[PDB]
């Protein structure tokens, strides 16, 4: 059972926190009395988020602007954020590259950009954050989607990057379990969220219910705080019930008696 | 010449026959050894036209020779690295010119990988995504016009590590999961765009290839399935236009791998766009 006091005094990074779900997470964390470091490209929008974080009761609030297309910026950002807060308890990996609903034809550029921003930068940010996370027995929160678990048309590049997140983070979670690394990994599988970007992208074409961004952001924080392996948040109760793969968890437990690492 | 007809009649979506590959124009990547080499050998026996690729000219030459001996209608190789996106794009054009078209594209190559705990090896994370996933995308883009012409097939070789989580294969698993997300999404696109190009995702367990046996030695203790039958099962699925192929030593694995809930969610969401 979650309690907002679990985040009181915690040192948290939130990526893509200038708008949408990311901004909402920063706001909830601020209300909880956490130390926050927010990032995105827009200095001006980040400044506004930092100001209202302080107004909500954040123990401290800072921003560092830059693009996650740059792996050097991603690595340096974590070092600077950790130096500002004097450590790190939670790393929330939320940013994605701008994407839309379009058929795939020959845009290898958009496939590469999505893999770099949505997946490779999460790996670099994890590598940079891990020593501090090992010190605090902290958590890694990875924001994904239904399109990161099941197939949908018009999101091929986006889906590839979200699936990669699962393959990578679920594999290191198994490694941490056998290596006795007390760092939790929360994969967040989300449905349609009423953010300005998502509403604009699904206008007309798609006909489905959007869930509120405020509660979504809170559910993500809850899972990370409770050290839940996975979080599921969608409008439909049919979706939430079918998204779980119990056979996958059984296969993994059956195969855990095949390797040696001692 | 003074003949015509169709191999694909009643039952041809369920029961395989080697004659379905007779005269077919097939590309096999990473075909100098392992499963890839075995696929080239089966296709040769079936009387298909084959174009093999891998980096080693010398090993590819040997594979080409054995294919011709087995009864391949034609057999050629083009050597190069799949780290090079220019080579990947040009390879398909050259292979298509050598065969006069393309019926099946078998995406099988991977970068050299081992069983090791994640250790911030960023170069291995990147090279894995590039060779194992991004080159498959470039090869697909290059091949698609000819596949559209022949109502052809794309065969994507993946792993159990491309469906479920295992330790010591983080970057490899990321690259194999990405293939699923990408190829399963475009399969849905082809269905609504009326693109008659099938996509077969192959989910393989441990296979007795020299590479895999060497890599698992003293780290992984599990039953290895024969490479010969594995290569045949992959060909079967592509020929039958099966969405997915599963091949593993354990019968418990073959029963648990399928995700019926995933197929239900997709069918439920198909009435939203
Ligand atoms: N909303 C939904 O329907 C939905 C559904 C499923 C999953 N999700 C997941 O939720 C997360 C957030 O989505 P959202 O809908 O809240 O998005 P959003 O409102 O568009 O915001 C994305 C954030 O990422 C930042 N960003 C974009 N490009 C960047 C770059 N190159 N470098 C660094 N930051 C960059 C943006 O700020 P700047 O432009 O100023 O850089 C922005 O703050 C994503 O991981 C998404 O996959 C959302
Ligand atoms: N064996 C198993 O247990 C197993 C299990 C599940 C799935 N699989 C999948 O099966 C497929 C084949 O595996 P395998 O065990 O048969 O592997 P393998 O014998 O080691 O073959 C890999 C092939 O790819 C080539 N290759 C490597 N790097 C390359 C590059 N940069 N550019 C182009 N070609 C390159 C290799 O030849 P060169 O070095 O001469 O280039 C070789 O022909 C892969 O997709 C693998 O993921 C295998
Ligand atoms: C900007 O995209 C934001 C919106 N995001 C999603 O993940 C939501 C979905 C999507 C994906 C990309 C789009 F462009 C538009 C919609 C994705 C999961 C669900 C099924 C479909 C695929 C449609 C919705 C809801 C990231
Ligand atoms: C290059 O080796 C080839 C072998 N390959 C596999 O995919 C097989 C596995 C693996 C993965 C990478 C390795 F290096 C070693 C083993 C993978 C699927 C199964 C469970 C485990 C993960 C162990 C085996 C069997 C690529």
């Amino acid at each position: 059972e979650f309690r907002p006091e679990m985040l009181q005094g915690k040192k948290v990074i939130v990526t893509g926190a200038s708008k949408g779900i990311g901004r909402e997470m920063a706001y909830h964390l601020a209300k909880m009395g956490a130390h926050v470091v927010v990032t995105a490209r827009s200095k001006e929008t980040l400044q506004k988020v930092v100001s209202h974080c302080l107004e909500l009761g954040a123990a401290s609030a800072h921003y560092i602007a830059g693009t996650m297309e740059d792996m050097t910026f991603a690595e340096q950002f974590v070092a600077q954020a950790g130096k500002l807060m004097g450590g790190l308890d939670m790393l929330i990996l939320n940013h994605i590259t701008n994407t839309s609903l379009n058929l795939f034809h020959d845009d290898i550029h958009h496939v590469r950009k999505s893999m770099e921003v949505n997946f490779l930068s999460y790996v670099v940010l994890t590598v940079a954050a891990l020593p501090m996370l090992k010190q605090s027995n902290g958590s890694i929160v990875v924001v994904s989607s239904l399109a990161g678990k099941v197939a949908y048309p018009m999101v091929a590049a986006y889906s590839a990057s979200k699936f990669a997140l699962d393959g990578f983070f679920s594999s290191i979670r198994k490694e941490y379990s056998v290596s006795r690394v007390n760092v939790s990994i929360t994969l967040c599988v989300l449905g349609l969220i009423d953010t300005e970007t998502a509403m604009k992208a699904v206008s007309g074409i798609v006909h489905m219910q959007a869930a509120p961004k405020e509660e979504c952001a809170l559910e993500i924080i809850k899972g990370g705080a409770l050290r839940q392996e996975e979080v599921y948040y969608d409008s439909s109760r049919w979706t939430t019930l079918l998204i779980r793969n119990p056979c996958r968890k059984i296969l993994e437990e059956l195969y855990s008696t095949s390797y040696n690492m001692d």
Side-chain angles (χ1 to χ4, degrees), chain A residues 1-18 20-47 49-104 106-257 259-262:
Chain A
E1 197 84 77
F2 174 80
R3 301 265 237 121
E5 291 76 32
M6 285 171 181
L7 277 306
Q8 188 184 297
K10 293 292 163 195
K11 296 140 183 184
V12 194
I13 279 168
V14 192
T15 77
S18 59
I21 307 175
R23 177 168 63 182
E24 294 303 318
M25 285 188 286
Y27 289 176
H28 282 291
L29 291 160
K31 284 184 269 168
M32 287 173 203
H35 301 275
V36 296
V37 180
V38 298
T39 190
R41 296 170 299 179
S42 189
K43 170 195 272 88
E44 294 77 14
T45 310
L46 284 174
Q47 273 161 345
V49 173
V50 164
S51 297
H52 259 67
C53 280
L54 292 158
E55 295 287 24
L56 292 166
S60 68
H62 295 95
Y63 78 93
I64 309 159
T67 190
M68 290 296 181
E69 289 165 274
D70 191 341
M71 301 305 136
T72 300
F73 168 78
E75 188 182 341
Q76 294 167 346
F77 162 73
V78 174
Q80 243 86 278
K83 205 180 165 187
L84 283 163
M85 293 187 293
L88 186 67
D89 295 290
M90 189 180 281
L91 173 80
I92 308 176
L93 300 176
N94 172 85
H95 70 276
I96 58 154
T97 200
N98 292 345
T99 190
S100 61
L101 287 160
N102 274 107
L103 292 162
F104 176 82
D106 71 326
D107 202 2
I108 185 66
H109 161 273
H110 179 61
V111 180
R112 186 177 268 100
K113 191 155 277 197
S114 310
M115 206 52 75
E116 285 287 312
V117 182
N118 315 359
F119 165 75
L120 194 76
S121 79
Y122 280 37
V123 180
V124 176
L125 295 157
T126 297
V127 162
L130 210 64
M132 286 185 279
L133 285 170
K134 280 168 168 174
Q135 191 82 255
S136 71
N137 301 298
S139 304
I140 302 158
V141 185
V142 182
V143 187
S144 187
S145 163
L146 292 179
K149 286 280 190 183
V150 298
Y152 301 93
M154 286 91 65
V155 293
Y158 176 75
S159 179
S161 83
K162 294 300 196 181
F163 262 76
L165 278 182
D166 190 9
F168 182 85
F169 285 100
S170 296
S171 171
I172 60 156
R173 187 194 286 121
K174 254 102 186 88
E175 290 183 18
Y176 291 179
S177 195
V178 293
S179 297
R180 312 285 324 249
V181 173
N182 315 302
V183 175
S184 63
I185 295 154
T186 308
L187 185 66
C188 306
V189 190
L190 321 175
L192 193 49
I193 313 300
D194 72 351
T195 69
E196 292 190 49
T197 302
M199 293 306 97
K200 209 149 275 159
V202 301
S203 197
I205 319 141
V206 148
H207 314 104
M208 74 175 88
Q209 192 63 75
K213 56 179 185 171
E214 296 81 9
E215 190 173 56
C216 181
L218 184 72
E219 291 309 313
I220 295 165
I221 294 160
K222 285 174 167 185
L226 301 173
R227 307 175 77 84
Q228 283 178 225
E229 291 199 352
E230 297 202 343
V231 165
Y232 315 103
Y233 189 81
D234 188 271
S235 282
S236 189
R237 202 253 202 92
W238 280 41
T239 304
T240 62
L241 262 56
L242 285 155
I243 193 62
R244 288 174 160 75
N245 197 4
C247 293
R248 156 158 171 188
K249 297 291 171 184
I250 289 154
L251 253 193
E252 290 167 6
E253 196 77 285
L254 266 154
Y255 270 91
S256 67
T257 58
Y259 12 80
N260 142 66
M261 276 152 284
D262 50 84

